[PDB]
Ligand binder design. Structure first.
Ligand SMILES: CCNc1ncnc2cc(OC)c(OC)cc12
Length: 125
């Protein structure tokens, strides 16, 4: 059974548009998105569809690139670090729910390395 997906808007949360957040969407997210390993990460896990009834019993802070993309597009974040934390949560969830060697973990490992390459240098404010 599925929990609500993470929020992509929150009227009482302060918004900010920064060069670094613009970069995270235009370059970081949209480059990862096109990777051949991106597809398991482009939407919230559907435990009913994917037959993973154990997923949300294990993962308590769900995150995915679909959610991140919407947050960036909706100006949800205050700064780039907040968005980077969502990416780190997404990767960490994968490692927690699975185990070393799994096909999905090999995918997360490759995307995480590409992610780090991209955020190594960010634009200035
Ligand atoms: C769209 C299909 N996605 C998936 N299919 C099979 N197993 C998955 C396992 C996962 O846990 C890390 C997962 O979330 C990243 C997506 C999975």
């Amino acid at each position: 059974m599925n929990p609500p997906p993470p929020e992509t808007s929150n009227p009482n949360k302060p918004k900010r548009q920064t060069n670094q957040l613009q970069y995270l969407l235009r370059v970081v997210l949209k480059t990862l998105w096109k990777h051949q390993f991106a597809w398991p990460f482009q939407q919230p896990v559907d435990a009913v569809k994917l037959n993973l009834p154990d997923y949300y019993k294990i993962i308590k802070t769900p995150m995915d690139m679909g959610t991140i993309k919407k947050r960036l597009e909706n100006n949800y974040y205050w700064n780039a670090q907040e968005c980077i934390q969502d990416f780190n949560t997404m990767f960490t969830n994968c490692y927690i729910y699975n185990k070393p060697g799994d096909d999905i973990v090999l995918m997360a490992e490759a995307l995480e390395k590409l992610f780090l390459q991209k955020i190594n240098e960010l634009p200035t404010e």
